[model samples]
Each structure stands twice: as structure tokens, then as C-alpha cells.
Target: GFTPHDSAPYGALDMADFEFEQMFTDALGIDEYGG
Candidate 1:
């Protein structure tokens, strides 16, 4: 148990959400490609 720190840093803040590749996999690549 590491308490309820869902805002650590990297692998820590995302303990409950390990989708580190979300930006690269689920991002609308066209929304902010060259904005």
C-alpha cells in the first residue's frame, strides 16, 4: 500500500493507470500534430 498519491511523478502517479503509451496510441495524432 503506497497511500493515495495518484499524483507521484511517472510510474508512481500512474499506479492505477499504466497507460504510458496513451499519448502515442490513443492521441488524435491530427489534433495537435503541427499546431
Candidate 2:
């Protein structure tokens, strides 16, 4: 696996951990990002 980045060192991924996943799902209005 590899880590993708954005804005130099910032991480841009689906590192969901309860809150993150919930928020993301709500934001996207989808079940999962399918990543």
C-alpha cells in the first residue's frame, strides 16, 4: 500500500475511524467511498 498526499504533506485518503467515516458518509450521502 501507498500513502497519497495533497498540499505538500497533507494526507488525502479514506482513513476512516468511526467519526471520520460517519462524517464522510454524511457529507457524500453515500454508503462508502469504495476505496
Candidate 3:
């Protein structure tokens, strides 16, 4: 079950997304020494 909230704080999304992606990739035996 899923409910989408279209009205949330998105200003910090990029930062959060980047952190999450890096964490996921790292935990999945991937590395991203991005700039």
C-alpha cells in the first residue's frame, strides 16, 4: 500500500536523494566517488 504526498518539502530533496543514493549504492557493493 502506498500513498503519495505531493506536497512535501522538496527544497532539501536533492541533498537527501544524493545521500540516499550514495548510501544505497555503497551498501550494494557499489562505489561512487563522485564530484
Candidate 4:
């Protein structure tokens, strides 16, 4: 819903990003950061 930058307007989140948990990543079929 929002980014950690507060309101800088740079490096904004684009995709399904928000410090996602394990289940989402595992179910999504990708590593937490990398496989």
C-alpha cells in the first residue's frame, strides 16, 4: 500500500513488494531473495 521512503518519490515499489513472508514467496515459486 505504501513505500518506506516516506515521500521521497524515488525508488518506489512497483510490483508485489512489501517485505513479503515465506508462504507467499514459496507459493509464488521463487526464493525469498534468490534460489
Q: Please, what is the TM-score per model? A: 0.16, 0.25, 0.30, 0.17
The digit string of per-residue lDDT tens for model 1 on 2-35 reads 7785664554454334465654476664686576
Q: Candidate 4: global Cα-lDDT?
A: 0.57
| Each prediction's whole-model lDDT (CA) | 0.56, 0.62, 0.66, 0.57
lDDT of 1 at 14: 45
Candidate 2 residue pairs in backbone clash: none
lDDT of 4 by residue, 1-35 (tens): 97585655666755545445534565654556765
Cα deviation of 19, candidate 4, in Å: 6.1
Model 2, CA-based lDDT: 0.62
Give the Cα-based TM-score of candidate 3 against the true structure. Answer: 0.30
Q: After aligning candidate 1 to the native by TM-score, how far in Å is the CA of 2 from where it should be?
A: 42
TM-score attained by model 2 = 0.25
Q: What is the lDDT of residue 19 in candidate 3?
A: 79
Candidate 3 runs further than 4 Å off: 1-13, 29-35
**Backbone collisions counted per model:** 0, 0, 0, 0
Q: Which tens-of-lDDT digit does each residue in 1-35 have in candidate 3?
A: 98887756755556666778777774653556773
Please tell me which predicted candidate would have the highest lDDT against the true structure.
Answer: 3
| Runs off by more than 4 Å, candidate 1 | 1-17, 26-35
